[PDB]
Amino acid sequence: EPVMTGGPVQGKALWTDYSGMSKEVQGPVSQILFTQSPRTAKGDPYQNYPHYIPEGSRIVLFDLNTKELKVLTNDFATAFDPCTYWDGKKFAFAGVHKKGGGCQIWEMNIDGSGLRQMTDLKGTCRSPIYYAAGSIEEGEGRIIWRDEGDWKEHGMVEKTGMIIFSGSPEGVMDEFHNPYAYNLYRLDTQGGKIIQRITGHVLSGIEFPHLNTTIDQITYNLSSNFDPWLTPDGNILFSSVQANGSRAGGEGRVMICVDNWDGAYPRPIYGNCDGEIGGTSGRSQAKITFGDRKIVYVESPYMNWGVGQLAAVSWDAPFNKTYEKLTGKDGGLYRSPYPLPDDRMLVSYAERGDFGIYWFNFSKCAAGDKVYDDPNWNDHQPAPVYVKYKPRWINTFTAGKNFGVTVVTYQPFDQVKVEGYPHSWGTWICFDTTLSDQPVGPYPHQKAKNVSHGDIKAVRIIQGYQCVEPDSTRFRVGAGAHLLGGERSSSNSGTAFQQRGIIGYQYVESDGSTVTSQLSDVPYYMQILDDKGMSVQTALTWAYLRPYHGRICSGCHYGSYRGRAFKNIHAKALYNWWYDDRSHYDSPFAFRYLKFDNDGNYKGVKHGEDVVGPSGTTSQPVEGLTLDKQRTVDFRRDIQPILDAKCAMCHDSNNPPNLGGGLELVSVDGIAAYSRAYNSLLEPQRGKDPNIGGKYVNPSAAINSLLVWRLYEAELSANAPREKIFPIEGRLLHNKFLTQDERYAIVEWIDLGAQWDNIPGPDFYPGYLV
Amino acid sequence: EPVMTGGPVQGKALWTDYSGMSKEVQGPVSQILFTQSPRTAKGDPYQNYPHYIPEGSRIVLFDLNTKELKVLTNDFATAFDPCTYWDGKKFAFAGVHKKGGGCQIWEMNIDGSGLRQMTDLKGTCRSPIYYAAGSIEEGEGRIIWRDREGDWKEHGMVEKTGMIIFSGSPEGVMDEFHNPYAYNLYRLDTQGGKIIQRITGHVLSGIEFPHLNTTIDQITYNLSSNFDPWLTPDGNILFSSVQANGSRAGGEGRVMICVDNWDGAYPRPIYGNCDGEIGGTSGRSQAKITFGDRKIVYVESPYMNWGVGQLAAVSWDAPFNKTYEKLTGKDGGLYRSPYPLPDDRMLVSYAERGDFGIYWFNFSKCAAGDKVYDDPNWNDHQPAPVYVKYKPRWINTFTAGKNFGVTVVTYQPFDQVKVEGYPHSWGTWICFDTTLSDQPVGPYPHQKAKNVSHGDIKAVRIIQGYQCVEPDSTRFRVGAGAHLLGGERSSSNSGTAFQQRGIIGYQYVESDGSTVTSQLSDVPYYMQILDDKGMSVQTALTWAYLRPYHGRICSGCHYGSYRGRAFKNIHAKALYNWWYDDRSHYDSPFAFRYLKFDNDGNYKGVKHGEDVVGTTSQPVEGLTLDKQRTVDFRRDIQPILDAKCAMCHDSNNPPNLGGGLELVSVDGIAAYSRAYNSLLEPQRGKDPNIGGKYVNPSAAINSLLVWRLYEAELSANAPREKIFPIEGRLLHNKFLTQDERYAIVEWIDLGAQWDNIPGPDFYPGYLV
Ligand code: HEC
Ligand code: HEC
Ligand code: HEC
Ligand code: HEC
Ligand SMILES: [Ca+2]
Ligand SMILES: [Ca+2]
Ligand SMILES: [Ca+2]
Ligand SMILES: [Ca+2]
Ligand SMILES: [Cl-]
Ligand SMILES: [Cl-]
Ligand SMILES: [Xe]
Ligand SMILES: [Xe]
Ligand SMILES: [Xe]
Ligand SMILES: [Zn+2]
Ligand SMILES: [Zn+2]
């Protein structure tokens, strides 16, 4: 039947309609594949979701007729996450082999034969799915490329598809300090020659020669991205954890979103914004119905749980008006929903707690007739066999790591090894930086004051540093529990903000437009700045650019990437982007420093000492591509000496705050992490949300910080830190105590999240030791 | 061991120390009682909590040693909620017998003999506990009273079994979530009223069960469910209360841990109901207190109506955020029904994957410890270990139950209705400062619409809530106002989350901000402070109740005097207006029916009604339930709109007030008129709980409509960015008289309902 569009004949859908032809191409379903896990904390660790390794689990095939069941995975100690191929005669999954090798991606046919190992990766791998690019019809396809030059066929490749999966390295911590950080990877199954078929060059990334496969990382988020799936328009639907800093009451949120299979254009779908339903509930295992086009997902009571109730929001219009509750009146737990083109669904359901496979009933808003339920197994992840129609494959302008593809001749190129760049780079542009749907408020993701065109002088670009602490004696979690951070603090910072550094600064045009070139394949976010160089509004999220890629946005959280059409805007920055035919991008790279006038106003942007094979492929000087020399503000190395020199003299235990004591660690509740000055400055204030700030300090807002208010001796923002600020008796002007560099160093420190240890891993600077 | 205080000897505790004496009197634990439930949605309906009737369940006795189990409940169709007596040789529970009779309260010896039915009620009964009042020691107490101007003499004696506090719901009622149950706490005389007669000198007033030789009295009048009562160290009742009132708590509501006296004289919050606290909308149930470190331990469910979930704890001595802990506390499963022992051990009902069992708790590993007993075919919960319980101190009661007070002078019981001649039970309350609050200036109804000082608050509006009762199923529909502000909690009666209400009356406020008044007793109520225009500046969202003859004091308006702070020392004018006369119970003025204003509509004074009827020196007013005034949109507002508004307001000139009382179909539901739908319409970028375009429920002063009717800026909260148009402006202040305008004001402050008359009536409404 036709769904999205009309067909050539009444009763039949056009070939451009995915959900319409998945109807017809499906075919009868006699058989189903599903995962059986032992019932144990460690047998079914859904509480650790996305990081899920149901040790001792098997993937099994059950036919709905004779009702036989066969175990395909018997060679594996652990097996889970079944995903069927297009024809339905084979599937891919995640497993731990009895011979070892860790938890990796595997694939085998439906009969149990043809076992092949996809991933040798060091880390954990799960959630494989088939996204076929350049492969529609079954067969072989041609590899063509260019050498004055021509386009020649160099021979062929079997066209099967690509594998999109979630994976995480080891010795890594997320923003919740869990010992995993997941992300999305695209995998060439032919050894990189499918990418070479599409792009004209083999996939760049981590290579697995012995397995004849290649992997590339399409999502750089510092927290876990997981459960990838297919959108009707041919993109990747998945779940993303945004924990960044104090965002969303400090507990962050798990959103359903989509991204291109090369990770070129990630955008939110539902759950990440204020006003939206579900709060801190976890959203996982999201799939889309064919008939009514609804995104159906598991809504877990707890953020990290993989089981819960069933929620739905229309894919066409993902808003609160289309939200609905599919379950919850039987008090049972649901997981792993699987919509069918027949407008049926297979759900894993535990009424009183024994999980089994059941047909879903939409009329009863609950689980229907039983398929297969073993009392000795949690039966979940149903994956029925049938012919799946194939989503559209979008053109990729990246060959993967360090590799871009020209927009002119479409020729793959390596920015590092060949062109001589220190690191792969890309661009981004905002048409209006003063344009927002956010009001003026105390919270860092809001405006600290009204800003018009010309009010925003420049922008700060910050790169998130992953938290890696191999030595457990040099790192402790919850050392700042008495401070603003709470349980999300650590030996590194007294706030919820983890270690990060400055990518660099970029000026803003008078109309509020800005554009810049910067590092790629790295997590980053940005802050709009006033004439004093302080952040008015902070973007709390993790953005990433693929090599040579660039990204546009209408405004600052204006909704252009969420719920609203692009506003038509003619911007100055557009003419600063690429004007030269011999260049990839003519847009300026992020500047390292700032220059101010005598009054402390913003004079402009200043170059650093990192300037750079290299080729002539850009007009502007190359700055900030060296990861080694990237600058950050560390409290011990930078701020503390300033405090000792210009402050601690008049500030002791008798004159709060107490800045004395130097770098000597102060024991709090049996934990010695930071010094006296840090503990003093990060101290909470009664009646104030610590997610906003403390007495003297507001993380990621300098303009809202009482300390900065006093250092500039003025009221900087529309949010007052407290009722009485400037004493009417015995007041002392603090504005002349510091130079501009020191004061703005403090400003930068606060805007960075006011950390303590900003240098990843154990270093020589004072800190937690046992 | 000494806990709260030092004892007579080192290592031993004073008898005044409840925790310590509980430690010393406990003894070794051998046998335990617990509930086994069938595993089904119908067999274990913990999603319907507080309303829980695990049909098919049984109560069993298990030996921790010989490991042999026995079913004591075999004669019952369903049994649950076991609670052991002080000696531990008998226990009380809830359930329905095979002979029928419904779900009731029973008690039985733990050997399985001596069954007795403590309750025969129309409704459902749950979670009985023993509260020993007048009985510390085993034996017979003597009954003594005054001879009606004679001496005090002894009449008879009574076996002292104490009393029984339980939670129960009537038949055919709806809560504020439109669930078909409303739970409240009841005290029960085990001896048939003569325990109360021993304490008071008159038998317990309330519903009598002469066949069971028992009597019950309702101690909590909250419109939503109060459930799972327990014992505090200081001798009060600890339980969970549902505060759903109106649009409060983001239109959701909260389940709070709170305490009250066994007669319900002094309800106060412990933890969970206030902004800035932890757990949000999480359900809080089955709370108990640890003996050693004195910590309240409760089940925190992710869903408000769920009875299973995690385990959290807060200090009893200091119930604040700083003392909040999450006991369990990670992987992988669910917890329910914790039971802290005096020896600091604990029994929890734990499900690792899917099925609950009895487990010792491990505080070091923050999870379930060694296994006690689990059947795979049963869900094993509600552990009730057998040991000796130390009796908490019993507090003096000044009420004999319904209509009955007890004087503070001679201490003799008196009936306010049958004898003294009052139409209804009446208590008093006093606030020393109505301008004193911990709340900031904000758009939400529980906050201040504007800054107010002494003298700025002229009077107060006292509002009685009406239980939602709809016998006819054809004339009532839930979710009729889904397109309006109410959302899912709306109905045929209201387009808001506010259910049906009425005005108890107005009371003036002294220049120092103090106020005192006499009003109805044993009815749910709350109040609003009013400015010189008679509009609510701040609304108290909760259900207060007064027992007969009982006064209730508070320092301020949500100031912390009843929550987190000490009473503020205040010398108030209202204090002298309370009781000055020898011949009177209370000399405080009753709530006035109306308010009278000046020419422009500013507050002049309070005006008596026609409901005015020698134990008080003031006119008795507002004690007649049938005469209680409310504001109905159809009867009161809509006519005014038709006469003075609908004229030039049509589809072309929004809002559209035309069409009269004719119903409008929205999403296939015909509930309200055109004017109601128009005025209750939501606004983009505005929290529906705050209000809509023209109407903010329970704030008139924040409403755009009222802003235009007075043609002025009323509050510090702007309804929208552009209020008054620049061109084409027309002044609306002269269109209405003060009566009509303030009628609209009253309508909005009441929650802006549609049907304010409970049950099916003759006025237009939903019909199918
Ligand atoms: C009976 C007392 C009423 C009520 C309750 C309202 N009106 Fe009127 N109205 C008229 C005109 C020309 C306007 C627009 C110009 C202006 O607002 O000054 C209005 C506007 C309103 C509003 C505001 C709507 C909004 O801003 O969105 C409201 C809430 C309102 N009205 C209610 C004209 C008349 C009129 C003569 C033609 C009469 C009589 C009324 N209105 C009566 C009433
Ligand atoms: C002696 C000349 C001082 C030097 C050197 C520094 N401060 Fe100071 N500070 C001093 C006084 C006498 C006071 C009293 C209050 C006032 O406003 O004069 C303060 C106060 C502060 C405060 C405000 C504390 C509060 O309001 O709670 C802050 C935030 C502060 N001081 C910080 C500060 C810094 C960063 C300094 C180094 C540049 C510093 N002080 C030096 C006296 C003296
Ligand atoms: C002003 C600062 C900006 C600018 C210039 C951009 N964004 Fe956006 N962004 C911003 C805020 C305040 C937030 C929410 C922060 C919070 O919730 O605490 C976001 C969020 C995002 C997200 C996450 C999904 C969402 O919230 O919608 C993405 C993805 C995102 N922003 C992308 C994005 C793009 C493509 C931009 C063009 C350069 C862009 N941001 C600019 C604020 C700001
Ligand atoms: C000003 C209006 C008052 C006055 C004069 C009193 N109370 Fe209190 N009340 C008030 C507010 C704003 C709230 C919270 C509303 C919300 O939505 O959260 C309350 C609530 C209560 C409660 C519930 C527990 C709690 O929130 O702490 C109780 C119990 C309570 N109020 C009792 C009470 C008493 C005994 C008073 C003395 C007469 C009293 N209130 C006065 C606002 C106000
Ligand atoms: Ca099973
Ligand atoms: Ca470090
Ligand atoms: Ca069991
Ligand atoms: Ca009615
Ligand atoms: Cl935007
Ligand atoms: Cl108070
Ligand atoms: Xe269509
Ligand atoms: Xe961003
Ligand atoms: Xe109240
Ligand atoms: Zn957002
Ligand atoms: Zn409160």
PDB file of N, CA, C and O in Angstrom, chain A residues 56-90:
ATOM      1  N   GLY A  56      26.813 -15.104  28.953  1.00  0.00           N
ATOM      2  CA  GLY A  56      26.128 -16.383  28.976  1.00  0.00           C
ATOM      3  C   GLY A  56      24.827 -16.389  28.193  1.00  0.00           C
ATOM      4  O   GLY A  56      23.950 -17.216  28.444  1.00  0.00           O
ATOM      5  N   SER A  57      24.703 -15.470  27.241  1.00  0.00           N
ATOM      6  CA  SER A  57      23.488 -15.361  26.437  1.00  0.00           C
ATOM      7  C   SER A  57      23.668 -15.952  25.046  1.00  0.00           C
ATOM      8  O   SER A  57      24.756 -15.899  24.471  1.00  0.00           O
ATOM      9  N   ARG A  58      22.591 -16.517  24.511  1.00  0.00           N
ATOM     10  CA  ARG A  58      22.639 -17.137  23.193  1.00  0.00           C
ATOM     11  C   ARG A  58      21.610 -16.524  22.249  1.00  0.00           C
ATOM     12  O   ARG A  58      20.533 -16.110  22.676  1.00  0.00           O
ATOM     13  N   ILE A  59      21.949 -16.458  20.965  1.00  0.00           N
ATOM     14  CA  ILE A  59      21.000 -16.018  19.948  1.00  0.00           C
ATOM     15  C   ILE A  59      20.369 -17.239  19.288  1.00  0.00           C
ATOM     16  O   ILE A  59      21.072 -18.158  18.870  1.00  0.00           O
ATOM     17  N   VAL A  60      19.043 -17.248  19.205  1.00  0.00           N
ATOM     18  CA  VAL A  60      18.321 -18.442  18.781  1.00  0.00           C
ATOM     19  C   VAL A  60      17.276 -18.176  17.697  1.00  0.00           C
ATOM     20  O   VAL A  60      16.755 -17.061  17.568  1.00  0.00           O
ATOM     21  N   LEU A  61      16.978 -19.224  16.929  1.00  0.00           N
ATOM     22  CA  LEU A  61      16.010 -19.159  15.837  1.00  0.00           C
ATOM     23  C   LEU A  61      14.788 -20.032  16.113  1.00  0.00           C
ATOM     24  O   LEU A  61      14.904 -21.246  16.292  1.00  0.00           O
ATOM     25  N   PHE A  62      13.618 -19.401  16.133  1.00  0.00           N
ATOM     26  CA  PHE A  62      12.364 -20.069  16.462  1.00  0.00           C
ATOM     27  C   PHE A  62      11.353 -19.881  15.340  1.00  0.00           C
ATOM     28  O   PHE A  62      11.088 -18.760  14.918  1.00  0.00           O
ATOM     29  N   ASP A  63      10.776 -20.976  14.864  1.00  0.00           N
ATOM     30  CA  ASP A  63       9.846 -20.905  13.745  1.00  0.00           C
ATOM     31  C   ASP A  63       8.430 -21.062  14.345  1.00  0.00           C
ATOM     32  O   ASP A  63       8.249 -21.817  15.292  1.00  0.00           O
ATOM     33  N   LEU A  64       7.446 -20.331  13.817  1.00  0.00           N
ATOM     34  CA  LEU A  64       6.176 -20.055  14.522  1.00  0.00           C
ATOM     35  C   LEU A  64       5.117 -21.138  14.288  1.00  0.00           C
ATOM     36  O   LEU A  64       3.943 -20.985  14.645  1.00  0.00           O
ATOM     37  N   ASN A  65       5.578 -22.220  13.670  1.00  0.00           N
ATOM     38  CA  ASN A  65       4.785 -23.305  13.102  1.00  0.00           C
ATOM     39  C   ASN A  65       4.781 -24.607  13.909  1.00  0.00           C
ATOM     40  O   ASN A  65       3.816 -25.015  14.563  1.00  0.00           O
ATOM     41  N   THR A  66       5.928 -25.255  13.785  1.00  0.00           N
ATOM     42  CA  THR A  66       6.298 -26.532  14.329  1.00  0.00           C
ATOM     43  C   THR A  66       6.661 -26.127  15.757  1.00  0.00           C
ATOM     44  O   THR A  66       6.399 -26.846  16.733  1.00  0.00           O
ATOM     45  N   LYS A  67       7.141 -24.881  15.848  1.00  0.00           N
ATOM     46  CA  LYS A  67       7.617 -24.246  17.073  1.00  0.00           C
ATOM     47  C   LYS A  67       8.888 -24.923  17.574  1.00  0.00           C
ATOM     48  O   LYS A  67       9.050 -25.160  18.770  1.00  0.00           O
ATOM     49  N   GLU A  68       9.791 -25.227  16.638  1.00  0.00           N
ATOM     50  CA  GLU A  68      11.133 -25.662  16.995  1.00  0.00           C
ATOM     51  C   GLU A  68      11.975 -24.451  17.391  1.00  0.00           C
ATOM     52  O   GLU A  68      11.658 -23.314  17.031  1.00  0.00           O
ATOM     53  N   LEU A  69      13.053 -24.705  18.124  1.00  0.00           N
ATOM     54  CA  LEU A  69      14.032 -23.671  18.439  1.00  0.00           C
ATOM     55  C   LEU A  69      15.449 -24.215  18.261  1.00  0.00           C
ATOM     56  O   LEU A  69      15.771 -25.300  18.746  1.00  0.00           O
ATOM     57  N   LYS A  70      16.294 -23.456  17.567  1.00  0.00           N
ATOM     58  CA  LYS A  70      17.671 -23.876  17.319  1.00  0.00           C
ATOM     59  C   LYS A  70      18.686 -22.822  17.760  1.00  0.00           C
ATOM     60  O   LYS A  70      18.507 -21.629  17.507  1.00  0.00           O
ATOM     61  N   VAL A  71      19.755 -23.271  18.414  1.00  0.00           N
ATOM     62  CA  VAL A  71      20.800 -22.371  18.889  1.00  0.00           C
ATOM     63  C   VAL A  71      21.938 -22.263  17.876  1.00  0.00           C
ATOM     64  O   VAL A  71      22.683 -23.217  17.658  1.00  0.00           O
ATOM     65  N   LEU A  72      22.057 -21.092  17.261  1.00  0.00           N
ATOM     66  CA  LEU A  72      23.071 -20.840  16.239  1.00  0.00           C
ATOM     67  C   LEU A  72      24.435 -20.482  16.824  1.00  0.00           C
ATOM     68  O   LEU A  72      25.475 -20.761  16.229  1.00  0.00           O
ATOM     69  N   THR A  73      24.412 -19.857  17.996  1.00  0.00           N
ATOM     70  CA  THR A  73      25.580 -19.188  18.563  1.00  0.00           C
ATOM     71  C   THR A  73      26.423 -20.044  19.506  1.00  0.00           C
ATOM     72  O   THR A  73      27.302 -19.521  20.189  1.00  0.00           O
ATOM     73  N   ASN A  74      26.145 -21.345  19.552  1.00  0.00           N
ATOM     74  CA  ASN A  74      26.778 -22.256  20.511  1.00  0.00           C
ATOM     75  C   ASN A  74      28.305 -22.162  20.575  1.00  0.00           C
ATOM     76  O   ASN A  74      28.909 -22.543  21.576  1.00  0.00           O
ATOM     77  N   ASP A  75      28.927 -21.661  19.511  1.00  0.00           N
ATOM     78  CA  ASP A  75      30.368 -21.435  19.508  1.00  0.00           C
ATOM     79  C   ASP A  75      30.755 -20.191  20.308  1.00  0.00           C
ATOM     80  O   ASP A  75      31.932 -19.967  20.588  1.00  0.00           O
ATOM     81  N   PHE A  76      29.763 -19.385  20.671  1.00  0.00           N
ATOM     82  CA  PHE A  76      30.015 -18.145  21.399  1.00  0.00           C
ATOM     83  C   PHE A  76      29.656 -18.253  22.875  1.00  0.00           C
ATOM     84  O   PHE A  76      28.600 -18.779  23.234  1.00  0.00           O
ATOM     85  N   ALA A  77      30.542 -17.748  23.727  1.00  0.00           N
ATOM     86  CA  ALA A  77      30.268 -17.662  25.154  1.00  0.00           C
ATOM     87  C   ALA A  77      29.162 -16.646  25.403  1.00  0.00           C
ATOM     88  O   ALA A  77      28.293 -16.852  26.252  1.00  0.00           O
ATOM     89  N   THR A  78      29.195 -15.548  24.652  1.00  0.00           N
ATOM     90  CA  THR A  78      28.159 -14.524  24.763  1.00  0.00           C
ATOM     91  C   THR A  78      27.658 -14.116  23.379  1.00  0.00           C
ATOM     92  O   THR A  78      28.448 -13.933  22.462  1.00  0.00           O
ATOM     93  N   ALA A  79      26.345 -14.010  23.211  1.00  0.00           N
ATOM     94  CA  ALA A  79      25.796 -13.569  21.931  1.00  0.00           C
ATOM     95  C   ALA A  79      24.522 -12.749  22.101  1.00  0.00           C
ATOM     96  O   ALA A  79      23.632 -13.131  22.861  1.00  0.00           O
ATOM     97  N   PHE A  80      24.426 -11.639  21.371  1.00  0.00           N
ATOM     98  CA  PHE A  80      23.257 -10.766  21.466  1.00  0.00           C
ATOM     99  C   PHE A  80      23.182  -9.753  20.324  1.00  0.00           C
ATOM    100  O   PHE A  80      24.033  -9.742  19.433  1.00  0.00           O
ATOM    101  N   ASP A  81      22.154  -8.908  20.373  1.00  0.00           N
ATOM    102  CA  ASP A  81      21.897  -7.875  19.365  1.00  0.00           C
ATOM    103  C   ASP A  81      21.774  -8.412  17.938  1.00  0.00           C
ATOM    104  O   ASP A  81      22.598  -8.092  17.083  1.00  0.00           O
ATOM    105  N   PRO A  82      20.739  -9.225  17.671  1.00  0.00           N
ATOM    106  CA  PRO A  82      20.540  -9.721  16.305  1.00  0.00           C
ATOM    107  C   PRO A  82      20.032  -8.635  15.362  1.00  0.00           C
ATOM    108  O   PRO A  82      19.156  -7.859  15.742  1.00  0.00           O
ATOM    109  N   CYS A  83      20.576  -8.581  14.152  1.00  0.00           N
ATOM    110  CA  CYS A  83      20.026  -7.727  13.104  1.00  0.00           C
ATOM    111  C   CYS A  83      20.040  -8.461  11.768  1.00  0.00           C
ATOM    112  O   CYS A  83      21.100  -8.853  11.282  1.00  0.00           O
ATOM    113  N   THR A  84      18.866  -8.624  11.166  1.00  0.00           N
ATOM    114  CA  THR A  84      18.740  -9.399   9.936  1.00  0.00           C
ATOM    115  C   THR A  84      19.173  -8.607   8.707  1.00  0.00           C
ATOM    116  O   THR A  84      19.064  -7.381   8.673  1.00  0.00           O
ATOM    117  N   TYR A  85      19.661  -9.321   7.696  1.00  0.00           N
ATOM    118  CA  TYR A  85      20.053  -8.711   6.432  1.00  0.00           C
ATOM    119  C   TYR A  85      18.809  -8.382   5.607  1.00  0.00           C
ATOM    120  O   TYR A  85      17.684  -8.581   6.066  1.00  0.00           O
ATOM    121  N   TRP A  86      19.014  -7.883   4.394  1.00  0.00           N
ATOM    122  CA  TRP A  86      17.907  -7.459   3.546  1.00  0.00           C
ATOM    123  C   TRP A  86      17.079  -8.639   3.044  1.00  0.00           C
ATOM    124  O   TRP A  86      15.849  -8.590   3.054  1.00  0.00           O
ATOM    125  N   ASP A  87      17.752  -9.698   2.604  1.00  0.00           N
ATOM    126  CA  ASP A  87      17.064 -10.871   2.072  1.00  0.00           C
ATOM    127  C   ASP A  87      16.511 -11.750   3.190  1.00  0.00           C
ATOM    128  O   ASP A  87      15.545 -12.487   2.992  1.00  0.00           O
ATOM    129  N   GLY A  88      17.133 -11.670   4.362  1.00  0.00           N
ATOM    130  CA  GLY A  88      16.662 -12.396   5.527  1.00  0.00           C
ATOM    131  C   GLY A  88      17.277 -13.773   5.684  1.00  0.00           C
ATOM    132  O   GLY A  88      16.852 -14.557   6.532  1.00  0.00           O
ATOM    133  N   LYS A  89      18.274 -14.073   4.861  1.00  0.00           N
ATOM    134  CA  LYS A  89      18.952 -15.362   4.934  1.00  0.00           C
ATOM    135  C   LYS A  89      20.240 -15.284   5.750  1.00  0.00           C
ATOM    136  O   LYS A  89      20.927 -16.289   5.938  1.00  0.00           O
ATOM    137  N   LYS A  90      20.564 -14.090   6.235  1.00  0.00           N
ATOM    138  CA  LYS A  90      21.724 -13.914   7.104  1.00  0.00           C
ATOM    139  C   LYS A  90      21.510 -12.752   8.068  1.00  0.00           C
ATOM    140  O   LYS A  90      20.622 -11.923   7.868  1.00  0.00           O
TER     141      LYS A  90
END
